[PDB]
Amino acid sequence: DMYIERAGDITWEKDAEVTGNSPRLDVALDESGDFSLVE
Amino acid sequence: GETTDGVYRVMTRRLLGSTQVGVGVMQEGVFHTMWHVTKGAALRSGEGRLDPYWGDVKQDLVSYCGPWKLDAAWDGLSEVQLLAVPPGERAKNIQTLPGIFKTKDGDIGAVALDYPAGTSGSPILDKCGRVIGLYGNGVVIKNGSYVSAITQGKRE
């Protein structure tokens, strides 16, 4: 039995921690909603 | 039930203790999450019940109480923020410049941030605080790191 609990407001934060790269990937999406890499 | 707009954890008590299986967005009286988090099951909010209204396994999305309401899109140029809600941890904003998933049916923004599976459904926002999609359906690349699509629905 699943239940929900509030965790916060949805807002943009000034001076948030900035990280992560920006990869450009060739991908395929199957009928089950799974992504896979195309090579 | 609580129907105030915002980000919510999706929990279950079926397993050991109380386990966070994902996250979602309440907007305009509709709850939005990824299909793999709930498998389309009904949800509880206090003493109230939220019934599924629309869902699609291939998009990996589901809405409750009404149709999908989120329609903002990544501009393809700017940094966005993941409002990560990890299991047992406070909501925290992470800023990043999305990469891109190139598919035979068009390009989709993607974020290269790695959180536990129970973070699925956390919203990705633009600089106006609009939800441009949900985090949690993606791929594992060469180096073993996770990259999520920015998954967005269609507002009828």
Curated annotation (Swiss-Prot), chain A:
Forms a heterodimer with serine protease NS3. May form homooligomers. Interacts with human SPCS1. Interacts with non-structural protein 2A. Residues 4-39 are annotated as: Interacts with and activates NS3 protease. This is Serine protease subunit NS2B. Residues 8-30 are annotated as: Disordered. The central disordered region transitions to ordered by binding to NS3. Residues 1-39 are cytoplasmic. Required cofactor for the serine protease function of NS3. It is found in: Host endoplasmic reticulum membrane. It is a multi-pass membrane protein.
